[PDB]
């Protein structure tokens, strides 16, 4: 009775969506802490044990947090950090976006976690608003790593070649290169999220020259949408992130030294 009941987590509101389905909400029975519980099947692995193995690495307040998992046979109960704020996705007004300051804030915290993960040599590989969560105090938390993978290990980097993520966010070299560096791809996806945060619409369908939109951008025709909606400062920033050559793109270390990234905008409380 060192307990009693405490590890009884009641199933409730269905948070839904990926990976594939479903992540539930879990009030605890005794203390009713709230937790994110992702529900997975035997029908994966071993892709699961990978997600769970990575998820046991993450320790940052901008990265969703791991607690454990119950085996329950061919159903895995994933115990993950809960955020009440919901998807950053749902904070972007369509065709509008949001207040530059709110956007810059959210972006720092995104850079925060993405620097961190890259820190420990991991890449998320599907950064998008549906995947960037917000707690009660609107703090961005990167979630879902069933897709994230190890790219550095023992100091040595690995070039990725697997195509994955989400077309509108995925960077160009994912579509034109056999192998690529993991980090430049996460920056682009982050840049794209900045566009959507400052524009409330996505720039293009895929980073294919085959896309009228993508070509105009590489034309510099930034009187078109969305860049038209975007102010000059951050638009100077997206001009460095959304750089087709992954070797010429901006690096997060330099993104930290960008005029707009370091322009004062938002107040707290
Ligand atoms: O708090 C969460 N923690 C997670 C930890 C890991 C994973 Cl894979 C998902 C979530 C996760 N859901 C993904 C975020 N999105 C929906 C389900 C799931 C995939 C895409 C939430 C969440 N909290 C919410 C609060 C309100 C509304 C939804 C919410 N989802």
- What DSSP line would sit under 217-247, residue for residue? HTTT-TTSTTTTTS-HHHHHHHHHHS-SSTT
Query: Where among 93, 112, 135 does a domain terminate?
Result: 93
What was the structure determination method?
Answer: X-ray
β-pair partners for 117: none
| 77 and 172 assigned to the same domain | no
CA distance 201 to 95: 5
Other CB atoms within a 10 A radius of the CB of residue 31 amount to: 8
Give the mutation target among 18, 23, 85 for probing the ligand 1 site: most ligand atoms within 8 A of CB. 23
Residue 138 CA, ligand 1 centroid: distance in Å = 14
Q: 19 with 99, same domain? A: no
Distance CA 156, CA 205 (A): 33
Task: Output the known binding site.
Answer: 15-23, 38
Answer yes or no: do 125 and 62 share one domain: no
What is the SS3 assignment for 67?
Answer: strand
Binding positions for ATP are 15-23, 38
CATH of the domain at 140: 1.10.510.10
* Whole-number Å distance between alpha carbons of 256 and 6: 43
Q: Which residues are catalytic?
A: 126
Judge if 132 and 195 occupy the same domain.
Answer: yes
Q: State in Å: Cα 211 to ligand 1 middle.
A: 31
Which has the closest alpha carbon to 249: 204, 203, 183? 183
**Which atom from ligand 1 is nearest to the alpha carbon of 80?**
5
Do 76 and 105 belong together in one domain?
A: no
- CA 117, distance to chain mean position in Å, is 11
Decide: 42 and 73 in contact? Cβ < 8 Å: yes
At which of 93, 118, 147 does a domain end?
A: 93
Domain identity same for 121 and 5: no
Partner residues linked to 66 by β-bridges: 80
**Cα torsion 160, 162, 165, 168: sign:** positive
The count of structural domains within the chain is: 2
- Give yes or no for a contact between 137 and 105, defined as CB atoms under 8 angstroms apart: no
Same domain? 113 vs 239? yes
Answer yes or no: do 56 and 136 share one domain: no
Q: Which domain, by its residues, includes 44?
A: 1-93
DSSP 181: -
Asked if 48 and 40 count as a contact pair (C-beta separation under 8 A), the reply is: yes
Resolution to 1 decimal place, in Å? 3.0
CATH at 32: 3.30.200.20
Same domain for 89 and 101, yes or no, is no
Number of residues written out for the chain? 269
Q: Which residues line ligand 1 (CB under 6 A)?
A: 15-19, 23, 36, 38, 64, 80-84, 86-87, 130, 133, 143-144
Kindly give the distance from the C-alpha atom of residue 261 to the centroid of ligand 1, in angstroms, as a whole number: 27
Residue with CA nearest ligand 1 atom 24: 86
Please check whether residues 104 and 168 belong to one and the same domain: yes
Choose one of 87, 145, 165 to mutate for the ligand 1 pocket test, by most ligand atoms within 8 angstroms of C-beta.
87
């Amino acid at each position: 009775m060192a307990v009693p009941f405490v590890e009884d987590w009641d199933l409730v509101q269905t948070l839904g969506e990926g990976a594939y389905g479903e992540v539930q909400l879990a009030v605890n029975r005794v203390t009713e802490e709230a937790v994110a519980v992702k529900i997975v099947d035997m029908k994966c692995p071993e892709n699961i044990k990978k997600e769970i193995c990575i998820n046991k690495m993450l320790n940052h307040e901008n990265v969703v947090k791991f607690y454990g998992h119950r085996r329950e046979g061919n159903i895995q109960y994933l115990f993950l950090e809960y955020c009440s704020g919901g998807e950053l996705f749902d904070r972007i007004e369509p065709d509008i976006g949001m207040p530059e300051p709110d956007a810059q804030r959210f972006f720092h915290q995104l850079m925060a976690g993405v620097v961190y993960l890259h820190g420990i040599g991991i890449t998320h590989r599907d950064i998008k608003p549906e995947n960037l969560l917000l707690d009660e105090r609107d703090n961005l938390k990167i979630s879902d790593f069933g897709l994230a993978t190890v790219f550095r290990y023992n100091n040595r980097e690995r070039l990725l070649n697997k195509m994955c993520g989400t077309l509108p966010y995925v960077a160009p070299e994912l579509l034109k290169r056999r192998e690529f560096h993991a980090e430049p791809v996460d920056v682009w996806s982050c840049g794209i999220v900045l566009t959507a945060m400052l524009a409330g619409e996505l720039p293009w369908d895929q980073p294919s020259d085959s896309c009228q939109e993508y070509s105009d951008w590489k034309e510099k025709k930034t009187y078109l949408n969305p860049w038209k909606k975007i102010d000059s400062a951050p638009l100077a920033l997206l001009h460095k992130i959304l750089v087709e050559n992954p070797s010429a793109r901006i690096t997060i270390p330099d993104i930290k030294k960008d005029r707009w990234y370091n322009k004062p905008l938002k107040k707290g409380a």
